Amino acid sequence: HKSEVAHRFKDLGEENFKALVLIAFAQYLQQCPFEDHVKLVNEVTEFAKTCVADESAENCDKSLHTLFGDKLCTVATLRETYGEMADCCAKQEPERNECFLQHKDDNPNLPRLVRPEVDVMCTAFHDNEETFLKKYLYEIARRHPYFYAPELLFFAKRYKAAFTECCQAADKAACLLPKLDELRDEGKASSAKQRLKCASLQKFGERAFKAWAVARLSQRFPKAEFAEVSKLVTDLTKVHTECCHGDLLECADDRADLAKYICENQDSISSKLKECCEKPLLEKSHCIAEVENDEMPADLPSLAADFVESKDVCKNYAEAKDVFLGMFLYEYARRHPDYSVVLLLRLAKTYETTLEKCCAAADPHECYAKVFDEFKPLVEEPQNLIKQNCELFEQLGEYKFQNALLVRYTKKVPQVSTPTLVEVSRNLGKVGSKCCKHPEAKRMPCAEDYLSVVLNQLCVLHEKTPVSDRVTKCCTESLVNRRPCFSALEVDETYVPKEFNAETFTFHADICTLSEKERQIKKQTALVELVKHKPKATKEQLKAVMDDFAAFVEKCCKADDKETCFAEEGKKLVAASQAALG
Ligand SMILES: O=C(O)c1cc2c(c3c1c([N+](=O)[O-])cc1ccccc13)OCO2
Ligand SMILES: O=C(O)c1cc2c(c3c1c([N+](=O)[O-])cc1ccccc13)OCO2
Ligand SMILES: CCCCCCCCCCCCCC(=O)O
Ligand SMILES: CCCCCCCCCCCCCC(=O)O
Ligand SMILES: CCCCCCCCCCCCCC(=O)O
Ligand SMILES: CCCCCCCCCCCCCC(=O)O
Ligand SMILES: CCCCCCCCCCCCCC(=O)O
Ligand SMILES: CCCCCCCCCCCCCC(=O)O
């Protein structure tokens, strides 16, 4: 178009345009105050309106990258605040934009965002809704500078809905706080999955990513032909390749192009896309990314015909090995939306290993005739793991389920920092409560998506301050093998029990007046420390100390001299436990 800024303004609408301009500036200029950014947005928006009124007005024909770069280089504090980044202004495009991307700071060292009191938030929301929400959008964007801006805008709108509902409700905090907890977790997860996809693309390569995409789209679009799934896989891998490079505009265009193609070819792809494809440009690709699986065709044949029984297996394989393997994955994935993607990838890797070995024998058919028997234990392992864990979760409930995992995992990797052991076990308990509520058919995909997040949260923390060779091995192995590796960890036999420390197991009256969450973490922290000191304690011995501890807290909270009860009966609890263990 003659004026790309006018085209964006008309396509997005003013409100959306202004919010995305704020995010973009915040993600590049992560240290400038909110008020500086608001002025930039207003200036850009007033310029944009000139172009909408006259596409041939001055500078309206300039590229969005040129205009955006020119505006960054007008920031007066650019060299004093960002130093080296101000030298990108001496360059011409496209080198100037590439230079700017290189100086995005993923660890900007900003203070943690403190959640205000419910009444305080609801009052700010009423008195200045836009400043309240937009400031938070700026705070989140500068802290997550690679977070795809449209999706950040989508979260902002869900927050707005939470505040308009709950701030006019009788019990505001009971309404609002769980909504903010759930939204924060979702945003954390979404951010983590974006980073995970890019990290995996670079380490393991384009081929491995295309395999993941073949499985993902085949489950989603089971009625589409292989050739159509494979075309979509190529474009999706290009979308993620570009998007991981970090250029928002290039990422947005590539995504809009794929959404446009998908929506123009619904009849060849899926019957679930009609609603997404009626949505505005801004939301189309995100809607499609989250579309529900289409219903699979009825009476699909067994895979044994084309992949086991046919005389042409090795011939078809050797002609074009990745196309044949992609076809195997497509046929398996479309039939099993109830599998994790990595499970489907394990089956493809198993089939490939068998074909490489067998097609070289004189009688390949005999060699690979039982290959579908090798899939059975691979399928059953996560299936059984899900059944066992969900049944234990129903028996124990979320808190006690977290403590079951806390003990188990402290014993396997006692060297991990106690805060990390608590957070990971807590989050894994949340995966149980979320996914176990699903029917069996959807449990394993649910578990995979949330475990990907939790386990990479563990890996990156460990990466920063490593402690255990076994955790680094599971974190650096095949992502397809990441979950089985963590599951195969055994109790650390060579761990030297940590030395007793008195104040670690000293408790005060503050525990009674703490929030339920902080009291849970306080107790979970001490349970980890208990196992790190007595790693060989049996489950009976541990339950007894936990039962003793529970009596000690409820007796000393109702005590009228609370402080001395906690000290006196605490010395008793510790001395009794030190003899009931070891
Ligand atoms: O934990 C935070 O600091 C945090 C606090 C928050 C959030 C988010 C947060 C994060 N995070 O993990 O940084 C990611 C997010 C990703 C998308 C959307 C929102 C958030 O929106 C309101 O208060
Ligand atoms: O990668 C995925 O999980 C994903 C899965 C998908 C997709 C898309 C996906 C993504 N993504 O990045 O999420 C972006 C997209 C952008 C434009 C069009 C489609 C998609 O359409 C169906 O299955
Ligand atoms: C993309 C996010 C846009 C706005 C999100 C914040 C809206 C106000 C709620 C912030 C309160 C703190 C949230 C928290 O710490 O859990
Ligand atoms: C200088 C960049 C900010 C102004 C232009 C931002 C345009 C973002 C496009 C958002 C629409 C994406 C559509 C999609 O994801 O499919
Ligand atoms: C569209 C190309 C599909 C190619 C299929 C490759 C064969 C499937 C095996 C997948 C192995 C992935 C390696 C890994 O990440 O562990
Ligand atoms: C409490 C943990 C969540 C519920 C049980 C999950 C079962 C283990 C993982 C299942 C499969 C994950 C993806 C995979 O490895 O194939
Ligand atoms: C925090 C360091 C220890 C991390 C322990 C690995 C977590 C195991 C994930 C594998 C599936 C979890 C469900 C299960 O307990 O079987
Ligand atoms: C040497 C150990 C001294 C005794 C201290 C016991 C600390 C164990 C904390 C038990 C936490 C589990 C209780 C709960 O979650 O309700």
Side-chain angles (χ1 to χ4, degrees), residues 54-57 59-121:
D54 185 0
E55 69 188 71
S56 45
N59 301 322
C60 284
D61 59 329
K62 295 189 159 164
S63 96
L64 289 190
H65 282 120
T66 292
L67 287 165
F68 187 69
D70 288 349
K71 190 60 167 191
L72 296 174
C73 289
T74 63
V75 181
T77 44
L78 197 64
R79 180 174 303 280
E80 297 238 88
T81 306
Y82 304 94
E84 196 179 354
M85 177 186 296
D87 297 324
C88 306
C89 293
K91 319 201 183 299
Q92 279 96 84
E93 299 289 0
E95 205 171 329
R96 174 177 73 175
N97 177 68
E98 299 282 0
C99 186
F100 275 124
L101 281 181
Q102 303 276 9
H103 292 85
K104 273 192 176 186
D105 186 353
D106 218 8
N107 313 297
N109 292 324
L110 294 173
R112 104 168 170 102
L113 276 185
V114 166
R115 176 179 285 171
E117 294 295 293
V118 169
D119 292 322
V120 168
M121 290 186 290

Side-chain angles (χ1 to χ4, degrees), residues 312-325 327 355-356 359:
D312 291 334
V313 170
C314 290
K315 166 201 160 55
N316 288 348
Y317 178 54
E319 280 179 343
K321 297 184 167 192
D322 284 6
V323 168
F324 196 75
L325 292 166
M327 300 176 155
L355 283 198
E356 286 285 318
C359 286

